[PDB]
RNA sequence: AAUUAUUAAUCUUGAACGAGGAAUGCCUAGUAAGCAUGAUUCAUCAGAUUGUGCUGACUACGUCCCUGCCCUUUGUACACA
């Protein structure tokens, strides 16, 4: 029953991880579950997507919870 | 599976070997005598699932 | 010693009295010493009694009673609390 | 003009049960900005029923020894959980939590009574205050055990537990425990 | 007077232990639990005791079922009971 999360992004996986931007709720646990990636990776993609303003903050973030949502 | 509501009118006493049950009298408008688990007061409301049944006196 | 004037039973002016048998344990006890209880009971309790009324023909029904007339020996009787142990002065209190 | 956490109003929420109305308090003195009041609620028998309903929830997240007394941490966990419940299935987060309380407790149970010397597991009824206590307790333990040794954080598990409980779906710890209690009670009386 | 290494400091090594069977303890409010600290012994050594404060729940508002102690009635061939 071992998880085998990937620890980086492949060329094939590169395009697939970006659709996540179009998600109702956005959190590292949900990103890692849908794409089978690490949690350290899931934080890296959120920081990339947030800086270019493709993802909207739902509320004031904490150091332990980092939920987001789609821009609309 | 469906509930029926009754109004408590007075507590009569406590039953059970360890004293963890409460004896009450309730009205829906017929009167019934029922046996309750948990803290109760006069004016409380109980959701009864079985309608035609009672408890013996104390 | 000699803790009872009548000896635990009511026999006078007689030699022998035939025995009966205990309703609970089958023991033999003379008739003048067993404790007799006559009970008039109901077939069912008051809740199941009114269910029989409204499922009945004749529109006015009286359930019959039962008559038993049980008898017991001393040991099988005071273990079931039909009779208790009393103090010295209260032992003389009849009816 | 008072909101909970400065965001949610509870000025149009109702119980719609008529049995738990007097037992759970969203009203004049229970309207608070934040769930931290240093009240004295365990000095009389029924003063527990005047504590604000959300403060009773935060009082239950500090369990299993390791987290005794950490009240501020529990306030944070619940605050972020109420945000998730709003983001998906967009509604008043407190209204959802009220619905969970009304559906998470058993309506009858069974107890041992030696009425005629013979003891049975004869069934009984549950009082409204007992129902409310059970709902709060069953929801917290379900979230707590779901997050032990898991990727999902404590706040995400709590939000998922509350939504499922109010939806009567048998994927919540509360609903399947409630049905196990009532199944036995039905069998016994 | 430091070997059977008093105590501290630095760099390496990196064992059992994935919440514990039959059983069993202490607790009803600023209490349980968690967190530290003063003092005693003291040339040098607290994983102990005795105090002090900080954060701060759930559950009952009862009962004689289990275990003890007390009261009345009753039986005794026990009185080192
Ligand atoms: Mg003769
Ligand atoms: Mg006793």
TrEMBL record, chain A:
A single BP term in Gene Ontology: translation
Keywords: Ribonucleoprotein, Ribosomal protein
Gene Ontology molecular functions: structural constituent of ribosome
GO cellular component entries: cytosolic small ribosomal subunit
Keyword Ribosomal protein appears in the UniProt entry: yes
Presence of the UniProt keyword Ribonucleoprotein in the record: yes
Stated family: Belongs to the eukaryotic ribosomal protein eS25 family.
Name by which UniProt lists this protein: 40S ribosomal protein S25
UniProt source species: Plasmodium falciparum (isolate 3D7)
Residues of the full protein shown: 34 to 105 of 105
From TrEMBL, chain B:
GO molecular function, one term: structural constituent of ribosome
Keyword hit for Ribosomal protein: yes
SUPFAM superfamilies: Nucleic acid-binding proteins
Domain of life per record: Eukaryota
Pfam families, A to Z: Ribosomal_S28e (PF01200)
GO BP terms in the entry: maturation of SSU-rRNA; ribosomal small subunit assembly; translation
The keyword Ribosomal protein belongs to this UniProt entry's keyword annotation: yes
Any single GO CC term annotated in Swiss-Prot or TrEMBL for this entry: cytosolic small ribosomal subunit
Alphabetically ordered keywords of this record: Ribonucleoprotein, Ribosomal protein
UniProt xrefs under HAMAP family: Ribosomal_eS28
Family under the similarity heading: Belongs to the eukaryotic ribosomal protein eS28 family.
Protein's recorded name: 40S ribosomal protein S28e, putative
Naturally occurring in which organism (per UniProt): Plasmodium falciparum (isolate 3D7)
UniProtKB/TrEMBL annotation, chain C:
Gene3D superfamilies: Ribosomal protein S26e
One Pfam family cited in the UniProt record for this chain: Ribosomal_S26e
Organism ancestry: Eukaryota, Sar, Alveolata, Apicomplexa, Aconoidasida
UniProt similarity note: Belongs to the eukaryotic ribosomal protein eS26 family.
Example GO biological process: translation
Keyword Ribosomal protein in annotation: yes
Protein keywords: Ribonucleoprotein, Ribosomal protein
UniProt-recorded Gene Ontology molecular function terms: mRNA binding; structural constituent of ribosome
The protein's name: 40S ribosomal protein S26
Disulfide bonds: 25-76
Coiled coil: none
One Gene Ontology cellular component: cytosolic small ribosomal subunit
InterPro entries xrefs: Ribosomal_eS26, Ribosomal_eS26_CS, Ribosomal_eS26_sf
Domain of life, source organism: Eukaryota
UniProtKB/TrEMBL annotation, chain D:
SUPFAM superfamilies xrefs: Ribosomal protein S7
A cellular-component GO term for this protein: cytosolic small ribosomal subunit
One BP term from GO: translation
InterPro entries from the UniProt entry: Ribosomal_uS7, Ribosomal_uS7_CS, Ribosomal_uS7_dom, Ribosomal_uS7_dom_sf, Ribosomal_uS7_euk/arc
CDD domains: uS7_Eukaryote
Pfam family name, one: Ribosomal_S7
Keyword Ribonucleoprotein belongs to the record: yes
MF-aspect GO terms: mRNA binding; rRNA binding; structural constituent of ribosome
Small ribosomal subunit protein uS7 domain mapped to chain residues: 32-189
TM spans (from-to): none
Record keywords: Ribonucleoprotein, Ribosomal protein
Keyword Transmembrane: no
Record family assignment: Belongs to the universal ribosomal protein uS7 family.
Name recorded for this polypeptide: 40S ribosomal protein S5, putative
Organism: Plasmodium falciparum (isolate 3D7)
